[PDB]
Structures are given as structure tokens and as C-alpha cells.
Design a protein around this ligand. Structure first.
Ligand SMILES: [Cl-]
Ligand SMILES: [Cl-]
Ligand SMILES: [Mg+2]
Ligand code: NI
Ligand SMILES: [Zn+2]
Ligand SMILES: [Zn+2]
Ligand SMILES: [Zn+2]
Length: 242
């Protein structure tokens, strides 16, 4: 069965940086983690694949000039190890409250609003890969220009049973509804959970060369959903033939 070897870049350090507005990238080369800041405290979304990368996230937060003690809320895209594995370490070292859609401190439902000072975020449940998959949205202002931001879950089909799933019986219908929900979200800035899903490394280089809108592409979430759904369709067709 699945050997769960980790691609090398999932645990490879990369320099943290400001993306847009009050959103900062603090993850690894391959696995995203995001710091969203306010004068009343910060949110961290995802923690990388293990306790060691959770420590790396901590040090990226403080390398950007912020205080770890000011992290107040931890959130998640989906609760598998590659995105959630570092959250327990961050929880222990920050005393922050861990939000997880229904060890967690608060459950939440679809359209839940998270507010912390200037931070306003909205959870959009996007079940499929797991029943708890959560995509997050927010908005920022960058050089006086308003921008909408979406943190989609991974839209993965890795290890999913799509025909005769006895656990998640509605899995195919959930995926298809989640695809539709994500398409219906206007999104100037898509910030995905894996580097290759957003070309984040190359965008960071564009930014260092002076591109002020390197992360802005209002068509990208539609293109990501379309690509994830094509891969979903292919895997579904394979499992149906077998
Ligand atoms: Cl996913
Ligand atoms: Cl994934
Ligand atoms: Mg827009
Ligand atoms: Ni389309
Ligand atoms: Zn997963
Ligand atoms: Zn992943
Ligand atoms: Zn998902």
C-alpha cells in the first residue's frame, strides 16, 4: 500500500517573504504555510509535514520580524500529515487556538467567518479528498489596490477510492460540488497548498526582479479547478473500468 515517501522539497527550507497585503509565505520549498498578520495577532494556515517543519515555520515567522507569541489562531486546508503534521508543534509553542472543521479547539461549518483585528477570513468547506477539506478566502489591499485571496485545499485524489467507497459514500458528489463551489469564488490571488500548484518559486523570483503583481492572476483558481477536475475524471474513469 502507499509507502508515503516524501518528495525532497517538502522539507527543504526556503526563505520567507511577504506575498500581498498582510499575507506572508513561511512554508518550505514544496509545502505552503501562510502567516496573516494584524495588530491584534496573527493567523497561521498549515504547518508542513512534521514537527521539524513546524519549527521551521516558527523560525520563518520570527525571521520576518514577528513574534511567535502573537500567533493566535491555527487553521488548516486538510488534516493529513503533509499539511497538518507541523500544527501540533506550532500549537504547543504558540498557545494558539487550532480551528478544524467538524486535537482541535474549535469546530466550524461552511461560510464561517474568522476575525482577528484587521483579519477577516471565510471558510468554504470543500470535501472530497477528505470530509474536512477547507478552502479559505480573504481580501487585502496592495499599493492601494484591492485584491481577493483564496487558499484552496489541494483537490487531491491520492489514495481515494471513488467507486464503492464504503466510508465516504457520497465522495464523487462531494468532489463535484466542491469543484463548483471553488469556481464560484472570484479570486485575484490564488495561494495553493503545494508549490507546483501555483508556481510559487518562480513567482517569488518574478517578485525579486521587481514585478509588483507577480502573485496576481484572477484566472488561476478557475484553471486550477479545471485541471484538478480533469485529473479527478481520469482517476474516476480508471476506477470505473477496473
Ligand atoms: Cl485535498
Ligand atoms: Cl495533497
Ligand atoms: Mg478582483
Ligand atoms: Ni473552466
Ligand atoms: Zn491528503
Ligand atoms: Zn498535500
Ligand atoms: Zn481537499
Amino acid at each position: 500500500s502507499n509507502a508515503d515517501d516524501m518528495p525532497a522539497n517538502w522539507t527543504k527550507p526556503t526563505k520567507p517573504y511577504r506575498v500581498v497585503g498582510n499575507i506572508y509565505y513561511v512554508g518550505t520549498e514544496g509545502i505552503s504555510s501562510w502567516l496573516i498578520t494584524s495588530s491584534e495577532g496573527h493567523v497561521v494556515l498549515d504547518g508542513g509535514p512534521n514537527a521539524e517543519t513546524g519549527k521551521l515555520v516558527e523560525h520563518n515567522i520570527t525571521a520576518l520580524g514577528f513574534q511567535l507569541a502573537d500567533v493566535k489562531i491555527l487553521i488548516n486546508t486538510h488534516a493529513h500529515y503533509d499539511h497538518a503534521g507541523g500544527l501540533a508543534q506550532l500549537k504547543a509553542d504558540t498557545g494558539a487556538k487550532l480551528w478544524i472543521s467538524r486535537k482541535s479547539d474549535r469546530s466550524f461549518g461552511d461560510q464561517t467567518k474568522l476575525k482577528l483585528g484587521e483579519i477577516a477570513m471565510v471558510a468554504h468547506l470543500t470535501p472530497g479528498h477528505t470530509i474536512g477539506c477547507t478552502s479559505w478566502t480573504t481580501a487585502v489591499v496592495e499599493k492601494g489596490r484591492p485584491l481577493t485571496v483564496t487558499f484552496p485545499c489541494s483537490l487531491s485524489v491520492a489514495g481515494n477510492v471513488l467507486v464503492g467507497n464504503k466510508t465516504h459514500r457520497t465522495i464523487v458528489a462531494d468532489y463535484r460540488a466542491s469543484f463548483a463551489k471553488l469556481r464560484a469564488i472570484p479570486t485575484d490571488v490564488m495561494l495553493p497548498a503545494h508549490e507546483e500548484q501555483g508556481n510559487l518559486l518562480a513567482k517569488r523570483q518574478k517578485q525579486l526582479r521587481g514585478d509588483p503583481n507577480a502573485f496576481v492572476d484572477p484566472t488561476e483558481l478557475a484553471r486550477f479547478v479545471d485541471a484538478s477536475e480533469a485529473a479527478f475524471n481520469k482517476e474516476l474513469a480508471r476506477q470505473q473500468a477496473a
